[PDB]
Amino acid sequence: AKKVQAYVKLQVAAGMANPSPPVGPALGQQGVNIMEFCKAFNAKTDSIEKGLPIPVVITVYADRSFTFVTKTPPAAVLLKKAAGIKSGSGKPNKDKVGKISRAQLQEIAQTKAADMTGADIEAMTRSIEGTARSMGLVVED
Template identity: 40%
Template sequence: MPPKRSIHQVTLQLTAGAAAVAELGKMLGQTGVNLVEIKRRYDELTAAQRGDVVPVRVTVFDDRSFALQLRTPPTSFLIRRALGAAGSARPGHDTAGTLTSAQLRAVAERKLPDLNTDDLDKAVRIVAGTARSMGVRVQG
């Protein structure tokens, strides 16, 4: 039997534990894959993170089977959650709040698997850059 061939691959940002079938249908409807089965499996895998935005890479194969690969939540989402507020409407002019070094480190530790570094100190600097671009002051 020949190996499965990937015919479609897409990354979606869905709400953990409560993926919307309509959102899946927009991106995967033309592939003919079972959308309800994708939703059920995604909701199962992300039930512990309910309420978070958890990106997933969906790969559809030529036999209409699929594979799901979960990612960590977006850095901006994690920063907003740690801050307890949204970013600034005018970054560089207005400040949305301040992140402590402990909060910054916690976000970097959670995001580390998806960053292009294995060093936690470099990951903290990457997250700090994202925070600054959102209008969030970084302490320490």
């Protein structure tokens, strides 16, 4: 009925499904178990982030099931796997904050234009460009 209903950002981005152990016990309100942890996410966690950050929206349903139009492959992962240097803020004014170039932007544009779109496909491309450039350091290209 109500989409998600519990919005808690306490889930490791991509990798292992439902990585509660690292995430910490402070968001225990959500009723996730071993039933909704490997239903749909387990079978579609390949073409988004293979070793990179791709936060996922649970989209829990009050219809006693779990399924929705899940988010497309993250730009956070696009600009972290096409870069090489996975760094960013915190140490952005001291050293490399990651790489950002037109190639990563084109990759994310041709990749993350399925569901993570905005006021244009090129607007989601500018989203990936902001998620790659505003880290604090960008490759010159």
